[model samples]
Target: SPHYQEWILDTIDSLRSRKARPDLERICRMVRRRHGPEPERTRAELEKLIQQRAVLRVSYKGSISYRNAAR
Candidate 1:
């Protein structure tokens, strides 16, 4: 649980440094490739924060991407 907590924080940090918002799958794949295992778990965790508006979920006409909420 502690490690998962770090992953979520680190993921938010990572997204804040990026120029583009990425969808759940993209973020999951990136985390899985770099951090190893549990893409589904990570995505679920991200969704929770997203629901609280901690992370921004930007959607186009048919596509969605998660972005940083921090100013």
Candidate 2:
């Protein structure tokens, strides 16, 4: 069930990236057209999906935390 749910959510994210976000209704329609309706996923569920898919990362800041990457 988790795998199926993740697949559906990832598909929705893909569709959103490809299409313009007009409004909430339009976005839902686009997702449905691409991957059908998705079940409600909790924050932990979504975070699990991110971890499983290697989509999560951490960024560190220096002591001063100023002009690190820019420099």
Candidate 3:
């Protein structure tokens, strides 16, 4: 059940398509509702994505949001 990586990326992609700021909490909650309630695991997956640069952590005005690296 480690596919949260792809699911999380898709969630960010979908949110970005909607022009929504995919913040940490928003991503966490969406993954929970759509996938499972593994908050810690979800966060860990997100960190891995960030580490791989598959996801970008954008910060503006002291706020953070997520973006898909390829799009």
- Predicted structure with the largest lDDT when compared to the true one: 3
* Tens digit per residue, CA lDDT, model 1, 31-52: 7887786887887878787787
List the global CA lDDT of all models.
Answer: 0.70, 0.40, 0.87
Candidate 3 per-residue lDDT over residues 34-70, each given as its tens digit? 9876778789889999999998999976899988898
TM-scores of all candidate predictions against the true structure: 0.65, 0.29, 0.85
lDDT of each residue in 1-71, candidate 2, tens digit only: 44644443554455446653323344344445655554333334445545666333233342211111111
TM-score computed on alpha carbons, candidate 3: 0.85
Clashing residue pairs in candidate 3, if any?
A: none
Candidate 2, position 67, lDDT: 12
For each of the candidates, give the backbone clash count: 0, 0, 0
Stretches of candidate 3 off by over 4 Å are none
Winner by TM-score:
3
